[PDB]
């Protein structure tokens, strides 16, 4: 599908261009699937101001910042749920099972939540660390559940989805905390599969992704029965087949 | 359970309850009733919608049949199906063994009578045989099933994930299948436009975000023998 | 046991043993010695139809969706 994105020519200047591209995907073909079953229009474009949400001093930015303030309607990408975030806007139902996960380097260190290495890396002989991406709500999501892990995290943070790939496979990471289907992604179609996902979410966050409206939108209702005919009827798990690869 | 789910919901916010149990021990399925020619709904919709009941505290199939008609909150419970069997090949891996796809009287399959499970396959036009064939051997309740395949006489039954991983963790013979399919979440079933949605469904997802859902787990689902 | 062989077709032959209980029967080959044919669409002389219903069917097997259908309604177990 056609896309959109007001990319600046320099830094000096806050003029920019529209540059156009194309999109592919899951939520693409979602989003697809919506417009043969509901029939209407839709105008997809990128986002200019960054990650998904983030309330700096009662201010969002990204697409809460332009869903809230009313300038689109709705989010088809997806975004985790939490507290305040349903506070300002009302979701959809979920369609599938994501919850969080860790990745490390058939034996197991670590068991979940309640690791003893989730204490004190002085406990252990060798210094580990682990940290998420910046800007996320999984860093809300710490915060409040632990503080002290939050200071831990602190000296332990890094900048990219793939740098922190990278850095686990050379081996300047030792643990990472995401999300759990889109980490199964990327191991499932890594060269020689040496870094192993932890569990199947049992002692995680378990949620699920969801459609972010406005709050009052009729089109809910119809949202609503559009992702539970498209569950209903194995079409979401053909798109699980051609959009995941389980190996092994 | 959902006891003391209902009694995190009463300590949240302020409010009595009535607990009682639905007359029957289905869920309730959309019949013909015998004049006129008027659809009816039964068990525990047929109890909600005429007045006698006010909250569905159950584990409550969502589909997109009862979302047309009432008002769904948020899944607390989120897992899929799986077939249950007592331990050539023991094991049948899911819905794609060709032998059940054309059955006989060896295969022994079925489920609970009047379930939302039935009207899943009833919505997929591919396996009306399925349909057809269950329909001679559909039991009352799952206990039923599980004292019929307890006494080899079944042998495959689909339900959910997580009752069955609780009752294999109680009975070392009953053994889960390998695949997940139909994955999906179990919420409260609710009235229509109503003030006890917005805060319960808040309340609901203040219990997702903290730790109770692993108490709910330390209580039942990680307690293992 | 009251016939020894069956002449017939090949393919209903096929579908039948990819559901016959335990696979006893035995087909043999895929028409090596036999006249190996084709089925198509019967019209009548002069129907301005044909050319539609060419251009559909080489649409239909042309994406897939013709192998699609054989998946659907052709088990080839055994």
Same mark, same amino acid.
């Given at each position: 599908?056609?896309?959109?994105?007001?990319?600046?020519?320099?830094?000096?200047?806050?003029? $920019?261009?529209?540059?156009?591209?194309?999109?592919?995907?899951?939520?693409?073909?979602?989003?697809?699937?919506?417009?043969?079953?509901?029939?209407?229009?839709?105008?997809?474009?990128?986002?200019?101001?960054?990650?998904?949400?983030?309330?700096?001093?009662?201010?969002?930015?990204?697409?809460?910042?332009?869903?809230?303030?009313?300038?689109?309607?709705?989010?088809? $990408?997806?975004?985790?749920?939490?507290?305040?975030?349903?506070?300002?806007?009302?979701?959809?139902?979920?369609?599938?099972?994501? $919850?969080?996960?860790?990745?490390?380097?058939?034996?197991?260190?670590?068991?979940?939540?309640?690791?003893?290495?989730?204490?004190?890396?002085?406990?252990?002989?060798?210094?580990?660390?682990?940290?998420?991406?910046?800007?996320?709500?999984?860093?809300?999501?710490?915060?409040?559940?632990?503080?002290?892990?939050?200071?831990?995290?602190?000296?332990?943070?890094?900048?990219?989805?793939?740098?922190?790939?990278?850095?686990?496979?050379?081996?300047?990471?030792?643990?990472?905390?995401?999300?759990?289907?889109?980490?199964?992604?990327?191991?499932?179609?890594?060269?020689?599969?040496?870094?192993?996902?932890?569990?199947?979410?049992?002692?995680?966050?378990?949620?699920?992704?969801?459609?972010?409206?406005?709050?009052?939108?009729?089109?809910?209702?119809?949202?609503?029965?559009?992702?539970?005919?498209?569950?209903?009827? $194995?079409?979401?798990?053909?798109?699980?087949?051609?959009?995941?690869?389980?190996?092994? | @359970?959902?006891?003391?789910?209902?009694?995190?919901?009463?300590?949240?916010?302020?409010? !009595?309850?009535?607990?009682?149990?639905?007359?029957?021990?289905?869920?309730? !399925?959309?019949?013909?009733?015998? +004049?006129?020619?008027?659809?009816?709904?039964?068990?525990?919709?047929?109890?909600?919608?005429?007045?006698?009941?006010?909250?569905?505290?159950?584990?409550?199939?969502?589909? +997109?049949?009862?979302?047309?008609?009432?008002?769904?909150?948020?899944?607390? *419970?989120?897992?899929?199906?799986?077939?249950?069997?007592?331990?050539?090949?023991?094991?049948?891996?899911?819905? +794609?063994?060709?032998?059940?796809?054309?059955?006989?009287?060896?295969?022994?399959?079925?489920?609970?009578?009047?379930?939302?499970?039935?009207?899943?396959?009833?919505?997929?036009?591919?396996?009306?045989?399925?349909?057809?064939?269950?329909?001679?051997?559909?039991?009352?309740?799952?206990?039923?099933?599980?004292?019929?395949?307890?006494?080899? *006489?079944?042998?495959?039954?689909?339900?959910?994930?997580?009752?069955?991983?609780?009752?294999?963790?109680?009975?070392?013979?009953?053994? !889960? !299948?390998?695949?997940?399919? @139909?994955?999906?979440?179990?919420?409260?079933?609710?009235?229509?436009?109503?003030?006890?949605?917005?805060?319960?469904?808040?309340?609901?997802?203040?219990?997702?975000?903290?730790? @109770?859902?692993?108490?709910?787990?330390?209580?039942?689902?990680?307690?293992?023998?």
């Amino acid at each position: 599908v056609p896309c959109r994105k007001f990319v600046k020519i320099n830094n000096s200047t806050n003029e $920019g261009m529209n540059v156009k591209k194309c999109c592919k995907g899951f939520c693409i073909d979602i989003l697809k699937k919506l417009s043969r079953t509901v029939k209407f229009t839709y105008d997809l474009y990128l986002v200019t101001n960054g990650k998904h949400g983030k309330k700096v001093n009662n201010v969002w930015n990204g697409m809460i910042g332009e869903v809230v303030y009313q300038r689109a309607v709705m989010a088809v $990408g997806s975004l985790t749920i939490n507290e305040e975030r349903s506070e300002v806007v009302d979701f959809s139902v979920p369609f599938v099972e994501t $919850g969080i996960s860790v990745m490390v380097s058939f034996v197991d260190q670590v068991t979940g939540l309640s690791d003893k290495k989730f204490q004190r890396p002085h406990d252990y002989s060798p210094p580990f660390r682990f940290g998420t991406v910046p800007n996320g709500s999984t860093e809300r999501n710490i915060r409040n559940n632990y503080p002290y892990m939050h200071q831990y995290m602190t000296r332990f943070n890094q900048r990219g989805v793939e740098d922190a790939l990278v850095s686990l496979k050379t081996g300047k990471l030792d643990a990472f905390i995401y999300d759990a289907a889109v980490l199964n992604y990327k191991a499932g179609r890594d060269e020689g599969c040496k870094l192993v996902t932890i569990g199947s979410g049992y002692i995680f966050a378990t949620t699920g992704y969801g459609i972010a409206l406005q709050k009052g939108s009729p089109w809910k209702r119809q949202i609503d029965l559009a992702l539970l005919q498209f569950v209903g009827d $194995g079409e979401m798990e053909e798109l699980e087949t051609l959009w995941l690869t389980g190996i092994c | @359970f959902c006891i003391d789910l209902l009694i995190k919901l009463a300590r949240t916010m302020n409010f !009595t309850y009535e607990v009682h149990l639905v007359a029957d021990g289905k869920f309730g !399925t959309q019949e013909r009733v015998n +004049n006129s020619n008027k659809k009816e709904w039964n068990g525990m919709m047929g109890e909600l919608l005429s007045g006698q009941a006010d909250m569905i505290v159950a584990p409550l199939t969502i589909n +997109n049949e009862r979302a047309q008609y009432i008002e769904f909150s948020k899944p607390f *419970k989120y897992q899929g199906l799986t077939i249950l069997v007592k331990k050539p090949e023991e094991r049948i891996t899911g819905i +794609n063994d060709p032998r059940l796809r054309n059955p006989s009287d060896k295969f022994i399959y079925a489920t609970v009578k009047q379930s939302s499970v039935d009207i899943y396959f009833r919505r997929q036009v591919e396996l009306s045989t399925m349909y057809r064939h269950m329909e001679k051997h559909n039991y009352e309740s799952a206990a039923e099933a599980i004292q019929a395949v307890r006494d080899n *006489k079944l042998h495959a039954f689909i339900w959910d994930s997580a009752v069955l991983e609780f009752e294999a963790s109680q009975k070392c013979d009953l053994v !889960t !299948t390998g695949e997940l399919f @139909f994955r999906s979440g179990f919420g409260i079933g609710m009235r229509k436009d109503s003030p006890w949605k917005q805060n319960v469904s808040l309340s609901i997802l203040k219990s997702h975000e903290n730790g @109770f859902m692993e108490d709910l787990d330390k209580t039942w689902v990680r307690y293992q023998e």
